[PDB]
Design a protein around this ligand. Structure first.
Ligand code: HEM
Ligand SMILES: CCOC(=O)c1cc2cc(-c3ccncc3)ccc2n1CC1CCCC1
Length: 409
């Protein structure tokens, strides 16, 4: 057996509020790459089936992610942990967003929404995001010190979402408020947030925006999404509203935490930080994502019996892909535990395994990371941390709530 405590759960929020279970992930990769992770009664993060299969190897993650005909996202959602007492109804509302849909409903939705993540559309965000990144850094440096997460990591990913959706300036304040109130409620610091409230307001704003853009068409990404194409396909108003609700999560706390941990990695590896400031290599973004793995894990449900790397997975059983483990697989990376911002190629699964659900925002994310870290180098090159970062209590998100930091040194 793999050497692990009894009653160990890799989706336990208690661990991730403290640390990442890196030694435990390494143990499984070596001794039990696919491992039944049982869960005590009542302690199933919202799922009362007794446990799941841990998936720790990159190739195993990639097999599951491409075989979405077997490994469903609809059946139980992809989030592997909620509050233990969460109602089944609240899990199943996730199916209203593309992420938790299967083919063919996902296939139709992904093809329409692809019209918003063309390389061309993302490039029109470059200039506005670059200028904001620069001012965010200058504003942060001028403060001398403070919470790096709030002052450097927080704002720009939200600007990318708002700029992509063309949200007018005056509306961005409440849009950021709602977007930031969607996850993390298992952490004591956010016990009082109601995601369903903010989501219903997000959908209302998103649907009103889509009604208005129909009446007054433009050359935005919104109007391309709600008016029909060759096949007569388009998002109806509520579907656009579920698209916005998804964007408010999928591209917010993820890029946020990659910026933070990416800076956390440059503190720990001064060699890489000195190198970065000199060459500003855009390969850093991928290494920063591999290092940060903002989504520790996503799950699937096997719709039929399936044999994966010599392990019989039974219909209805859950498999949880631990991207945190896959991104440090010794069989795929030379030195996984070397932060190397020049690593090329870099086949990390930070954006998920390739397949139907592979992150549509991967290139926007990489651009956001590259702009903000260029701005950090321009305005805050001698960044020194004050105190140790404060981790987020979450079973699937690898979050940093706060990080006290001096920008002058
Ligand atoms: C910056 C770090 C990011 C990380 C680590 C990340 C990670 C992921 C992962 C793991 C998936 C699921 C992969 C799979 O199931 O195969 C995903 C899907 C998705 N991501 Fe991201 N993401 C990031 C940024 C973004 C951004 C900036 C956006 C949009 C502005 C975005 C939008 C989406 C959407 C819409 C999906 C659903 C795709 C589908 O189900 O067809 N993500 N992301
Ligand atoms: C209106 C229907 O949608 C929602 O309420 C909703 C969508 C959603 C998406 C993510 C997500 C996470 C990671 N990468 C992409 C998307 C996370 C949470 C989400 N919730 C709220 C949940 C909290 C408990 C109830 C469900």
């Amino acid at each position: 057996s793999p050497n692990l405590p009894p009653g160990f759960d890799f989706t336990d929020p208690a661990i991730y509020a403290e640390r990442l279970p890196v030694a435990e992930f390494a143990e499984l990769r070596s001794a039990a790459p696919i491992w039944w992770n049982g869960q005590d009664p009542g302690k199933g993060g919202g799922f009362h089936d007794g446990g799941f299969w841990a998936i720790t190897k990159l190739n195993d993650v990639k097999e599951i992610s491409r075989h979405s005909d077997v490994f469903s996202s609809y059946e139980n959602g992809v989030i592997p942990r909620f509050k233990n007492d969460i109602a089944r109804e609240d899990i199943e509302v996730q199916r209203f967003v593309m992420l938790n849909m299967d083919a063919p409903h996902h296939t139709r939705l992904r093809k329409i929404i692809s019209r918003g993540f063309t390389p061309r559309a993302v490039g029109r965000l470059h200039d506005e995001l670059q200028e904001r990144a620069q001012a965010i850094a200058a504003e942060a440096a001028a403060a001398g010190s403070g919470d790096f997460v709030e002052q450097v990591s927080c704002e720009l990913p939200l600007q990318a979402i708002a700029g992509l959706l063309g949200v007018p300036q005056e509306d961005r304040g409440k849009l950021f408020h709602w977007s930031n109130e969607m996850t993390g409620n298992e952490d004591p610091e956010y016990a009082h947030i109601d995601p369903k409230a903010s989501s219903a307001e997000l959908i209302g704003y998103a649907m009103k925006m889509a009604e208005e853009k129909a009446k007054n068409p433009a050359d935005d990404i919104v109007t391309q999404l709600i008016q029909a194409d060759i096949d007569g396909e388009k998002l109806s108003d509520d579907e656009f509203g579920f698209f916005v609700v998804m964007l408010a999560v999928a591209g917010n706390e993820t890029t946020r935490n990659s910026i933070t941990q990416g800076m956390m990695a440059f503190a720990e590896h001064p060699d890489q930080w000195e190198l970065y400031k000199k060459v500003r290599p855009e390969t850093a973004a991928d290494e920063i994502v591999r290092w940060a793995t903002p989504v520790t894990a996503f799950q699937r449900t096997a719709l039929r019996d399936y044999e994966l790397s010599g392990v019989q997975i039974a219909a209805g059983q859950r498999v949880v892909m631990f991207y945190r483990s896959a991104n440090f697989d010794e069989e795929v990376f030379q030195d996984p535990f070397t932060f190397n911002i020049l690593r090329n190629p870099n086949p990390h699964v930070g954006f998920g395994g390739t397949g139907a659900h592979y992150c549509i925002g991967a290139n926007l994310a990489r651009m956001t990371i590259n702009l903000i870290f260029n701005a950090v180098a321009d305005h805050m090159p001698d960044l020194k941390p004050i105190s140790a970062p404060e981790r987020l209590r979450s079973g699937w998100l690898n979050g940093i709530k706060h990080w006290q930091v001096d920008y002058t040194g």
